Short mmCIF file of C-alpha atoms and ligand atoms in Angstrom, two decimals:
data_model
loop_
_atom_site.label_atom_id
_atom_site.label_comp_id
_atom_site.label_asym_id
_atom_site.label_seq_id
_atom_site.Cartn_x
_atom_site.Cartn_y
_atom_site.Cartn_z
CA UNK A 131 87.81 89.36 96.62
CA UNK A 132 88.18 87.72 93.20
CA UNK A 133 91.20 87.59 90.91
CA UNK A 134 92.73 86.48 87.62
CA UNK A 135 96.36 86.22 86.49
CA UNK A 136 97.53 88.84 84.01
CA UNK A 137 100.70 88.76 81.84
CA UNK A 138 102.68 91.98 81.39
CA UNK A 139 105.95 93.31 80.08
CA UNK A 140 107.73 96.39 81.32
CA UNK A 141 109.25 98.18 78.33
CA UNK A 142 111.91 100.85 78.06
CA UNK A 143 111.05 104.53 77.82
CA UNK A 144 110.21 105.52 74.23
CA UNK A 145 110.64 101.95 73.03
CA UNK A 146 108.79 98.64 72.70
CA UNK A 147 111.87 96.71 73.83
CA UNK A 148 111.93 94.90 77.15
CA UNK A 149 113.15 96.99 80.06
CA UNK A 150 115.60 95.72 82.68
CA UNK A 151 112.81 96.55 85.11
CA UNK A 152 110.82 93.62 83.68
CA UNK A 153 113.58 91.28 84.90
CA UNK A 154 113.05 92.39 88.50
CA UNK A 155 109.33 91.73 88.73
CA UNK A 156 107.59 88.36 89.00
CA UNK A 157 105.37 87.12 86.18
CA UNK A 158 102.51 86.81 85.67
CA UNK A 159 100.92 89.42 87.88
CA UNK A 160 97.34 89.46 89.13
CA UNK A 161 94.20 91.50 88.78
CA UNK A 162 92.14 91.68 91.98
CA UNK A 163 88.68 93.12 92.54
CA UNK A 164 87.82 93.80 96.20
CA UNK A 165 85.11 96.12 97.53
CA UNK A 166 84.33 97.05 93.88
CA UNK A 167 87.84 98.42 93.35
CA UNK A 168 90.43 97.00 90.95
CA UNK A 169 94.15 96.46 91.60
CA UNK A 170 97.11 95.12 89.72
CA UNK A 171 99.09 93.05 92.21
CA UNK A 172 102.73 92.51 91.46
CA UNK A 173 105.89 91.29 93.20
CA UNK A 174 109.10 93.29 93.15
CA UNK A 175 112.28 91.23 93.30
CA UNK A 176 115.32 92.66 95.12
CA UNK A 177 112.79 94.96 96.75
CA UNK A 178 115.50 96.71 98.81
CA UNK A 179 116.84 98.19 95.52
CA UNK A 180 113.52 99.91 94.73
CA UNK A 181 113.94 103.10 96.73
CA UNK A 182 110.94 104.79 95.08
CA UNK A 183 108.30 103.70 92.62
CA UNK A 184 105.37 105.66 91.28
CA UNK A 185 102.73 104.49 88.82
CA UNK A 186 100.55 106.55 86.45
CA UNK A 187 97.95 105.82 83.83
CA UNK A 188 98.30 106.93 80.20
CA UNK A 189 96.53 110.23 81.11
CA UNK A 190 99.40 110.82 83.68
CA UNK A 191 97.01 110.39 86.59
CA UNK A 192 98.58 108.98 89.78
CA UNK A 193 97.83 105.40 90.68
CA UNK A 194 97.91 104.70 94.40
CA UNK A 195 100.16 101.87 95.56
CA UNK A 196 99.95 99.91 98.76
CA UNK A 197 102.21 97.38 100.29
CA UNK A 198 100.55 93.93 100.59
CA UNK A 199 103.61 92.00 101.80
CA UNK A 200 107.31 92.56 102.57
CA UNK A 201 109.38 89.41 102.48
CA UNK A 202 112.66 90.64 103.96
CA UNK A 203 114.40 87.26 103.79
CA UNK A 204 113.71 86.77 100.09
CA UNK A 205 113.98 90.56 99.53
CA UNK A 206 110.63 90.74 97.70
CA UNK A 207 107.68 93.10 98.08
CA UNK A 208 104.10 92.55 96.92
CA UNK A 209 102.25 95.74 96.00
CA UNK A 210 98.77 96.66 94.78
CA UNK A 211 98.49 99.38 92.14
CA UNK A 212 95.02 100.97 91.82
CA UNK A 213 93.74 100.40 88.26
CA UNK A 214 90.49 100.44 86.33
CA UNK A 215 89.07 98.06 83.82
CA UNK A 216 90.33 98.90 80.35
CA UNK A 217 93.83 100.00 81.38
CA UNK A 218 96.43 98.70 78.92
CA UNK A 219 99.50 100.54 80.05
CA UNK A 220 101.00 102.06 83.14
CA UNK A 221 103.81 104.58 83.21
CA UNK A 222 106.28 104.06 86.01
CA UNK A 223 108.93 106.29 87.53
CA UNK A 224 111.45 104.43 89.65
CA UNK A 225 114.51 105.23 91.75
CA UNK A 226 116.79 102.20 91.87
CA UNK A 227 119.75 102.12 94.27
CA UNK A 228 122.24 99.35 94.66
CA UNK A 229 125.09 101.12 96.73
CA UNK A 230 127.58 98.23 96.61
CA UNK A 231 128.02 98.68 92.84
CA UNK A 232 127.72 102.52 92.55
CA UNK A 233 124.24 102.28 91.12
CA UNK A 234 121.80 105.08 91.89
CA UNK A 235 119.47 105.88 89.02
CA UNK A 236 116.07 107.26 88.11
CA UNK A 237 114.12 105.81 85.20
CA UNK A 238 110.82 106.01 83.40
CA UNK A 239 109.29 102.85 81.94
CA UNK A 240 105.92 101.67 80.67
CA UNK A 241 104.29 98.49 81.93
CA UNK A 242 102.23 96.89 79.13
CA UNK A 243 99.49 94.48 80.11
CA UNK A 244 99.13 91.52 77.75
CA UNK A 245 95.41 92.28 77.55
CA UNK A 246 93.52 95.25 79.00
CA UNK A 247 92.51 95.00 82.66
CA UNK A 248 89.20 93.06 82.50
CA UNK A 249 85.91 93.60 84.23
CA UNK A 250 85.56 90.80 86.78
CA UNK A 251 82.25 89.29 87.85
C1 LIG B 369 115.75 96.39 90.82
C2 LIG B 369 116.80 96.27 90.00
C3 LIG B 369 116.92 97.04 88.67
C4 LIG B 369 115.95 97.65 87.98
C5 LIG B 369 114.45 97.74 88.35
C6 LIG B 369 116.59 98.23 86.81
C7 LIG B 369 116.02 99.00 85.81
C8 LIG B 369 116.65 99.64 84.76
C9 LIG B 369 116.04 100.54 83.82
C10 LIG B 369 114.55 100.92 83.93
C11 LIG B 369 116.94 100.97 82.95
C12 LIG B 369 116.71 101.95 81.79
C13 LIG B 369 116.53 101.23 80.44
C14 LIG B 369 115.48 100.14 80.59
O1 LIG B 369 114.28 100.44 80.87
O2 LIG B 369 115.85 98.94 80.46
C15 LIG B 369 118.18 100.32 83.29
C16 LIG B 369 119.40 100.47 82.65
C17 LIG B 369 120.58 99.84 83.00
N1 LIG B 369 120.94 99.36 84.27
FE1 LIG B 369 119.50 98.75 85.61
N2 LIG B 369 117.95 97.93 86.86
C18 LIG B 369 118.18 97.18 87.98
C19 LIG B 369 119.39 96.69 88.38
C20 LIG B 369 120.59 96.82 87.72
C21 LIG B 369 121.78 96.08 88.08
C22 LIG B 369 121.90 95.02 89.21
C23 LIG B 369 122.74 96.47 87.24
C24 LIG B 369 124.18 95.94 87.25
C25 LIG B 369 125.12 96.69 86.68
C26 LIG B 369 122.20 97.48 86.33
C27 LIG B 369 122.85 98.16 85.30
C28 LIG B 369 122.22 98.77 84.24
C29 LIG B 369 122.77 98.93 82.91
C30 LIG B 369 124.16 98.49 82.40
C31 LIG B 369 121.70 99.66 82.09
C32 LIG B 369 121.78 100.07 80.61
C33 LIG B 369 122.12 98.86 79.74
C34 LIG B 369 121.05 98.59 78.70
O3 LIG B 369 120.40 99.55 78.20
O4 LIG B 369 120.85 97.40 78.36
N3 LIG B 369 120.89 97.71 86.70
N4 LIG B 369 117.99 99.56 84.42
#
């Protein structure tokens, strides 16, 4: 495997403004190439709140996610999202539940990479 950091901002549906979702992911993320496949690797903070997350490209194709690491003590989760070189955006659909505070919501957002996913040597 090889990798590079990549900056990103999650933005609110229909807007270029920062989404609250951006505040619950670590930055920067990473691009990884392994076995000729590309992934965006990112860390979800307060992972227990993220009851469902789905990623899509701009064409609305599904992007497979896998769990790389679950840090239960820190409540973080590292995931890989399948991507291709040239991707600039991802659409996300998330179900966020924090029961203590009566928070159970479904959102759409768009994750904007600083620069398009690169080809890696
Ligand atoms: C994993 C944790 C959380 C995630 C991923 C998340 C994500 C989001 C998203 C995607 C929206 C829709 C508008 C946008 O994209 O910004 C939103 C709205 C909102 N959520 Fe959350 N949220 C989280 C935790 C919280 C917490 C802890 C609170 C505490 C009350 C909260 C209260 C709110 C409020 C007040 C809004 C609308 C306010 C505004 O538009 O600025 N959420 N959130």
